[PDB]
Structures are given as C-alpha cells and as structure tokens.
Amino acid sequence: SWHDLYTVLTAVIPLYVAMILAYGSVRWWKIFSPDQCSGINRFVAIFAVPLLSFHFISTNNPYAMNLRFIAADTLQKIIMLSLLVLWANFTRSGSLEWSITIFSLSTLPNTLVMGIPLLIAMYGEYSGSLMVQIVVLQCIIWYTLLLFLFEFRGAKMLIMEQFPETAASIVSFKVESDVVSLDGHDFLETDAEIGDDGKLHVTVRKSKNMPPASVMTRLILIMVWRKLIRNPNTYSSLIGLIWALVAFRWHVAMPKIIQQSISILSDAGLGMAMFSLGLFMALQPKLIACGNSVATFAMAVRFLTGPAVMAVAAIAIGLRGDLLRVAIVQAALPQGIVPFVFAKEYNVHPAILSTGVIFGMLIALPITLVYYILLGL
Amino acid sequence: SWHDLYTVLTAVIPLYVAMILAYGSVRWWKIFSPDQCSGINRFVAIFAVPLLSFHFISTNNPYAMNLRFIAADTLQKIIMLSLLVLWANFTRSGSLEWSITIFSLSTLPNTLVMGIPLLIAMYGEYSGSLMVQIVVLQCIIWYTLLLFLFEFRGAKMLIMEQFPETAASIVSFKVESDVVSLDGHDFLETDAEIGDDGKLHVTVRKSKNMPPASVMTRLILIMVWRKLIRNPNTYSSLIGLIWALVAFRWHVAMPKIIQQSISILSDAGLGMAMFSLGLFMALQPKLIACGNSVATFAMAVRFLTGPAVMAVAAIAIGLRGDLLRVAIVQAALPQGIVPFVFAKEYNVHPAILSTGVIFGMLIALPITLVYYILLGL
Numbered sequence A, B: 001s002w003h004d005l006y007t008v009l010t011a012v013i014p015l016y017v018a019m020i021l022a023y024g025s026v027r028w029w030k031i032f033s034p035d036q037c038s039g040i041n042r043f044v045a046i047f048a049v050p051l052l053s054f055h056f057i058s059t060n061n062p063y064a065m066n067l068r069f070i071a072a073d074t075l076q077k078i079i080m081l082s083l084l085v086l087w088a089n090f091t092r093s094g095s096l097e098w099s100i101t102i103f104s105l106s107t108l109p110n111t112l113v114m115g116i117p118l119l120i121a122m123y124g125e126y127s128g129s130l131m132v133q134i135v136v137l138q139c140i141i142w143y144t145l146l147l148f149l150f151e152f153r154g155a156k157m158l159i160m161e162q163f164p165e166t167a168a169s170i171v172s173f174k175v176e177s178d179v180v181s182l183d184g185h186d187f188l189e190t191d192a193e194i195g196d197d198g199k200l201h202v203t204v205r206k207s208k209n210m211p212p213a214s215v216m217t218r219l220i221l222i223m224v225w226r227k228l229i230r231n232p233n234t235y236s237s238l239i240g241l242i243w244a245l246v247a248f249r250w251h252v253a254m255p256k257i258i259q260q261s262i263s264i265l266s267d268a269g270l271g272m273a274m275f276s277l278g279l280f281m282a283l284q285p286k287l288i289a290c291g292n293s294v295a296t297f298a299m300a301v302r303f304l305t306g307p308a309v310m311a312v313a314a315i316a317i318g319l320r321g322d323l324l325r326v327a328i329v330q331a332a333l334p335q336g337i338v339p340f341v342f343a344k345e346y347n348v349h350p351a352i353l354s355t356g357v358i359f360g361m362l363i364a365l366p367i368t369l370v371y372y373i374l375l376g377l
C-alpha cells in the first residue's frame, strides 16, 4: 500500500523540512548564532510547546479516554520501573542515574510533536486522541516521577557531600525560597543546629546512612512543588485538563477571542518545535554524541525494548487489533525531548538523551515504518 | 453595530496578545535576552515573514486583481513622490532622507501582518484579497524603489566623501562582489585610474558635481540587483507570483507534501511576527523614540495624510462604496516594518520609523475604528 506510505510521508516530512531548514541555517548557511539559537529554543520551550500541549489536552475530552490503552501504557512503565528497581537494588553495577536514563529511553517517546501527526496519518484521528491521552498522562504523572527521581538524586548528592558522617540524625529540612531547584548549577550551603531534645535540624540556602523516609519525603515534596510551580508544561497540562473537564461536562466552548489569542501562538507549535530541534542538532558538535556502542544500546532500547515491553503489557492487558498496533508503534516513536531536558539540567547522561532524541528523530521513519508493515502482516 | 466592533476585536486582539506577551517576556518577566530577542527577530524576518508573504501571494490569482484599486494605490504613491520631489528640489530645507522617510510614513502601511486580518474582519474576504494585492505590489515595486533611493543616497555619500573635486569625470564603476550593499556599516575604499583617452575609472572595494546619469544608473542598478538577490522577501514575492501565475493559468495545485512543508513554517507567521514586534517594543528604551513633537508629526502624517492622499487619489480614480472605504482604512493602517528595516540598515531616521511602527500599532485600533465608523455614516 504505497499510498499509505505516501500519506505518512506527507504528514511527517514537513517536520523534517523544518528540522533540516534549521540545521542548514546553523551549519550550511550559518543564519543563526549559538545564542540566537538558544533564544529560539527558549521561546519554543516556554511558549510554543506549552501552548501546543494546552491545545491538544484541551481539545480532547478526558471522559472518553480509552482506559485500556492508558492501562497498557502505565503497565509498560510499571514493568520498566520494577525491572529497574530490582536491577539497581540487586546488582553491583546497579545505579540510579542509569535507572532514570533507561526509563526515559525505554518508556518516554516523543508523543506530542511527532507522535500525534505520525499516528494520525498512520491509523486515524482516534489514534491522535490516544496519543494526546498518552501526552497528558506522561506530562502529569511520568515527568513528575522524573522530577521526583532527579530531586532525590540531587538531595542525596548534597547529603553525601555535606553531612555524610551523621546524616541519620537529621529530622527536618528548611530550604529558603531562593533555592529554586537542586539541579547543582548553584552551590548550596548547609547549616546544622542541635535542638533541645538532642535532635538535629538542617537549613540549606544559596551561596553512609539514610535519614528517615519522612524527612527525605518532605524535602523532595517541597522541592518538587517549587519546580512544578515554575514549569510551563505543568501549568499548560493542568489548565488544559481543568478546561477540558469544564468544557466537556458543561459543553462550554471557549470564547473565540481567547481561542484565537491562544491559537496565534499555538499554531507556531509544530514548526517552531521542529525548527528548534534542528537548531539543537546543528549546535551539537556530534550527531552520535554518546559514542557508537552506547548510542547503539540506546537506539536498541528505544526501538526494541520500548515496543517489546509495550507489546507484552498490551497483550497482558488485552489490547487487540488496531489498538495494539497503535500502542506498539507509539512505543516505537523517537525518544521524547522533555526527558532530555531534565537530563540536561540535571547533567545525568545528557549526551545519551541528546543522541536518542535527534538520531532517533532522523531514523524514526525507517524503524516506525518497518514496525507498521510488520504489524500489518 | 457593536457586534462588528467585537468581530474586529476578535480578529485583531490576538495579535496584541502575542505582542504584549513578548513585551512582558522582555520587560516584566525578562524571559529573553536582547541577543536572544535578536535571534527571534532574525528568524522572523528570514523565515516567518517571507513564508507568510509567499503564502498570501500564492493563494490569490493575479488575473483577478482589481485594477482600479491598484491604480488608486499607485496614484497615492505617485502623488506623494511628486510632492516630495518638488519639495526637495524647490526648498531650502528640502532633503532626500526626509523625502524617503515621509514617503514611508505616508504611503507604506503594515498591510501583511495586521492589514489583511484587520481588513478581512472589517469588510470581508475580498478585502483580504485586495490587501494581498497591495502587499505584492508594495514588495515588488515600492520596496524596490526604496532600495533604489537608499542605494542612491549611499552612493552619493561615498562620492562626496571620496572624490568631491572631480566626481564629474567618472565614467564607470566596478564594485567587487564582496561589497554586498552601500549601507555604510563597512568602510569602502576607492581607487581612481586615468584611462588612455583621458577618462577616469573608479573601483570600490571593502577595506559638488554629479557624474553622468548613465554612470550612477549603472552603479545603482548593479548594487540594487546585489541586494535583491539576497533579500528573503524578494524571493518570496517573486516565487509566489510565478507560482500563482502558473497555478491559476493551468489550475495546478501544489502537491500536498510541499504545501504542508511550507505551511508548517508559514503557520508561525502572524504569531511570530507579532511576538518579534513586541520584543522590539520592549528592547527599545523609548516608546516615543523620536521625540514628542516629531513623533506627533509622524503619527499625523501616517493617519491623516496617508488616508487623505489615498482618498483624493481614490475619488480621482473613481473608487466608490466599500472599495473606497477599504482603500482609505488600509491607508490608515499602522506604518509597515520593512520600510523601518531599510531605515535601520541605512540609518535614515530609524527612530522615526520605530515610533511609527510600534506606536501606531498600539494606537492603530482607535484611529482605524474611528475611520471605519466615520466612513460608515
């Protein structure tokens, strides 16, 4: 069915035209400076992607969500998390940063930018709705889980660097509001005060024992809240969900003035997202930025373990027909950007995630097609 | 008819939402650095505006152009040019830079970004087609005339600075291809060689008498060609005109793959144009950048002499009914950006054009409405 191939090409190749246009602008024609490219990327991440996410989340009703598809996706991610946990806590080389990066590679594809257009072209509008469900679920649950993991990593590094000898005695953390996140870019000073009852209180501000679960839970919860209240995508997804709920429970259409005020900048979503992705491709001196062997490992994870674990989860749940094919092909999408972002700010295998994103993007068509043809047999 | 007012507000206010969003991003929230803002602006000028112009020019057939409307616009501009010529050549204070800036203020509104949406909202789709006709005519003829004038200014300044005593003897100019334009940013060295027949030849490369009309014509023509072959809007308008001619003579629709490859970046046209305009508003330390008195003069010219000269030209030509109203209201639009751009690279009253553009943009609604209501009586 070469007509279906041409339809998929028509739907997907505009994104690559934009991406290659940006890549040539930075490499061939040198139209943009690195800081100008960074400015375009910042505009994208702050306005174009959050507004595109708001658009997609608001235009689908949460009450018609396919619960079985959601269960299949969450089961894939739960299987990945369980395997990673038992690998990290029962292995000599088991590690937390590797757990996070493997979770991102094997479970978090690019569902917003390329996923929705591609899957709509490949299967239909219902597939677009399913992809948007995956997008909302991912931005609300799994990116927040990534935030929890990254903040735990930062807190653990700070604890091991500040008070390793007697970290167990700490009972409460008080972080001044100036400390936005525990990324590690800024140095965080710590002071310890002994209480009347012999207890220890730690205060952290801007310049081998585990404390109780409650103390770390409090610290991570407050820090995660402080980073969520400053994440454009968090507000986008929340406000979109609330608006969708109210507008599909009471059938209330948004006023045309507000709808167009949002669309004027959301219409620049796909194009600017792909343009900034091309700018990033060009800026990076490498294309396989994490080494050939480990890059091959990351590609293999993304395009086999993602689809394979999604398949086992889907047949376990009971998905069949075009729904199972949509699930698997979605799992075979190129690795998402937001996990790469978090990896970059937290400097946790950022090269692996960059290679994932860009390389998979420009080899996502052959693999995704092969998947579609193979599943069609 | 407050419903018509609300429709105009719905059509126009999204642009101001984007513009104020950029203004706040640079001033209130300080999301963008000045160089990042410059990068966004450069992306706009190179991709979003040329692609938007290509879209608009290609989607209307040149064979259905309203010749009387075109004649009215060209008559307005011819009247302005004749008055400016007789003022500059028959007055003590008559000047060339003032001629160019007054022509830009009184004749070159923002017809692409705000003009088409506004006039479509106010009158209808045919008004959008008329505005696109004005856009194509302006980018092909009047911006090229601006280029001719600016290149003549630069050439005259170089002549007066290099060889004032015996400029009359020069017979031929030879500019090395490295010299892209005579803007004045780079210093241009000149060498004079006496020929066998007693003639003088000048060569200009990168570091009170008038020569014959032929020599200056040759120099200006070659320099204008060299700047046109590097203007994104020139290629946009040309290729759009050729495609429109071929696609409306043979009814040949563009392939969907190419159409979407172009649309993915042209869809970011209005939003990114207004976003960059807001970025420019914020970056400029002033809002009335050219002084209160001269800024008032520029606003008066823009919103009275433009509309008034357009009106006299339109009744002279024979426009009547909604066509005359569309002509006048279009003449009352805020001052265009491309003339401001040329003024900036040629450093010819750039503050006047900045004030024109931005100030008129955020006072274009009251004036344009007043015009619409007054013409409706």
Ligand SMILES: O=C(O)Cc1c[nH]c2ccccc12
Pocket: A049, A050, A053, A109, A110, A111, A112, A113, A134, A135, A136, A138, A139, A233, A335, A336, A337, A338, A339
């Ligand atoms: O991160 C991605 O690339 C895909 C994605 C899924 N949900 C999102 C929400 C906001 C921005 C991007 C995404």
Ligand SMILES: O=C(O)Cc1c[nH]c2ccccc12
Pocket: B049, B050, B053, B109, B110, B111, B112, B113, B134, B135, B136, B138, B139, B233, B335, B336, B337, B338, B339
């Ligand atoms: O310059 C303006 O702001 C309006 C306009 C008319 N014709 C144009 C062609 C390309 C870019 C802008 C314009």
